[PDB]
């Protein structure tokens, strides 16, 4: 269902930006086909398809655009197996490699720190993060997008009163409607903190577009 929500609402960079670099692959350790290695070790024939099904399923969960092209076994694990998996993304010409651990039902695990790039936000997380960025941005900060932002700084230092709480609540309603069409605000609650009398706590509750 996470795929369904991601396709409907979109995918994008996570906020705040984060960067990762995966661990290096010791290429001088994988020079033996897994299928020949299992066949040589007289493992059962029906185990080959069950083994390969586990590899394909685990990789697809890691990245569902993958298409396995080759597989190899580390020479330093001759029956906890270390596998270097080679795959292509969709119908592209790009190839990538990824380490894994196979255990003989067969179980396959992926190395924890293997992906290189940015962190992404999908579906509900994307729209939730989108509203968060709007709250933290003041108008005039975005270059060539001077209108974008919420602008709650204008209500600071005002006396805490019924007029202020309604002004804050109605301001949020109008700005979210203008700059966030994928979300609908269902309730806003403004309260004054007891331990810190000078601070206001705003509770915002949102629902997705067409979620019902």
């Amino acid at each position: 269902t996470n795929k369904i929500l991601a396709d409907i609402y979109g995918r994008g960079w996570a906020f705040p930006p984060q960067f990762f670099i995966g661990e290096r692959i010791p290429y001088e350790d994988y020079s033996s086909d897994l299928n020949k290695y299992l066949s040589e070790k007289k493992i059962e024939a029906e185990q080959i398809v069950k083994i390969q099904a586990c590899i394909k399923e685990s990789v697809m969960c890691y990245d569902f655009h993958a298409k396995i092209t080759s597989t190899q076994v580390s020479k330093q694990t001759n029956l906890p197996l270390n596998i270097l998996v080679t795959y292509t993304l969709g119908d592209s010409e790009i190839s990538q490699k990824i380490q894994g651990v196979l255990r003989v039902p067969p179980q396959f695990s992926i190395k924890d720190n293997s992906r290189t790039g940015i962190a992404i936000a999908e579906g509900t997380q994307n729209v939730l993060q989108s509203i968060n960025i709007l709250f933290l941005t003041e108008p005039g900060e975005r270059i060539m997008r001077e209108d974008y932002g919420c602008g709650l700084n204008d209500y600071l230092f005002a006396n805490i009163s019924d007029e202020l709480m309604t002004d804050i609540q109605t301001h949020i309603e109008e700005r979210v409607l203008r700059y966030e069409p994928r979300a609908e605000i269902t309730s806003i609650q403004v309260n004054q903190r007891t331990n810190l009398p000078s601070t206001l706590h705003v509770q915002v509750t949102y629902a997705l577009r067409g979620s019902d």
Binding site: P16, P17, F19, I133, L136, E138
Partner: protein, 48 residues
């Protein structure tokens, strides 16, 4: 007869323009990205 005197022809200097001056583009990001204060966390350093 008046005395003719021909001087060398020149294309005089124009106005020098401060093209070399550069302003970093990370200064245009909103303050919520953490690139305005001195970097102390790993996340701020990585973005820089």
């Amino acid at each position: 007869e008046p005395l003719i005197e021909t001087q060398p022809e020149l294309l005089n200097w124009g106005k020098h323009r401060k093209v070399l001056d550069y302003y970093p583009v990370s200064n245009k990001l909103p303050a919520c990205y953490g690139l305005q204060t001195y970097a102390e966390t790993q996340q701020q350093v990585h973005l820089h």
